[PDB]
C-alpha cells in the first residue's frame, strides 16, 4: 500500500488473498483425513477395552 | 445522465481519474473511487489564449 495507489493495488493484493485461501484449504483438507484415521483407531481401542 | 464541464491546464488531464491525488484533484474537483462514465478532452489553445 505504501508504494501503489488504490486503483491497481486493489488488483495486486487479490493474488495474496487467493493464495492464502488456497493454502488454508489444504490444512483443513488434511486434518479431515487425519481425524478419520484417528477415529478408526479410537473405535478399535474401544472394542479392545 | 449528468454532464459537467471545465477547463484546466493540459498537464493535469491524467489527474482526472478515481483515486488520483494532488493540488487540483484534492482541493477543487474529486471523482468517486467507484466512478462509472466516460471522459472526453481536447485542446483549447485556439479559443482560450
Curated annotation (Swiss-Prot), chain A:
Instruction: Give the superkingdom in one word.
Output: Viruses
Q: What is the documented function of this protein?
A: Subunit of the fusion protein that is processed upon entry into the host cell. Mediates fusion of the virion and cellular membranes by functioning as a class I viral fusion protein. Contains a viral fusion peptide that is unmasked after S2 cleavage. This cleavage can occur at the cell membrane by host TMPRSS2 or during endocytosis by host CSTL. In either case, this triggers an extensive and irreversible conformational change that leads to fusion of the viral envelope with the cellular cytoplasmic membrane, releasing viral genomic RNA into the host cell cytoplasm.
Annotated protein name in UniProt = Spike protein S2'
* Shown residues within the full chain: 981 to 1029 of 1273
UniProtKB/Swiss-Prot annotation, chain B:
Region (Integrin-binding motif), start-end ranges: 9-11
Subunit structure of this chain's protein: Binds to host ACE2. RBD also interacts with the N-linked glycan on 'Asn-90' of ACE2. Cleavage of S generates a polybasic C-terminal sequence on S1 that binds to host Neuropilin-1 (NRP1) and Neuropilin-2 (NRP2) receptors. Interacts with host integrin alpha-5/beta-1 (ITGA5:ITGB1) and with ACE2 in complex with integrin alpha-5/beta-1 (ITGA5:ITGB1). May interact via cytoplasmic c-terminus with M protein. May interact (via N-terminus) with host bilirubin and biliverdin, thereby preventing antibody binding to the SARS-CoV-2 spike NTD via an allosteric mechanism.
Biological function:
Attaches the virion to the cell membrane by interacting with host receptor, initiating the infection. The major receptor is host ACE2. When S2/S2' has been cleaved, binding to the receptor triggers direct fusion at the cell membrane. When S2/S2' has not been cleaved, binding to the receptor results in internalization of the virus by endocytosis using host TFRC and GRM2 and leading to fusion of the virion membrane with the host endosomal membrane. Alternatively, may use NRP1/NRP2 and integrin as entry receptors.
Name listed for the protein in its UniProt record: Spike protein S1
The organism is Severe acute respiratory syndrome coronavirus 2 (2019-nCoV)
Amino acid at each position: 500500500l505504501s508504494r501503489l495507489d488504490p486503483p491497481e493495488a486493489e488488483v495486486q493484493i487479490d493474488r495474496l488473498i487467493t493464495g492464502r485461501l488456497q493454502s488454508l484449504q489444504t490444512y483443513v483438507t488434511q486434518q479431515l483425513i487425519r481425524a478419520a484415521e484417528i477415529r478408526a483407531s479410537a473405535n478399535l481401542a474401544a472394542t479392545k477395552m | 445522465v449528468y454532464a459537467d464541464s471545465f477547463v484546466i491546464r493540459g498537464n493535469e488531464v491524467s489527474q482526472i481519474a478515481p483515486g488520483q491525488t494532488g493540488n487540483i484533484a484534492d482541493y477543487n474537483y474529486k471523482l468517486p473511487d467507484d466512478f462509472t462514465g466516460c471522459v472526453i478532452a481536447w485542446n483549447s489553445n485556439k479559443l482560450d489564449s
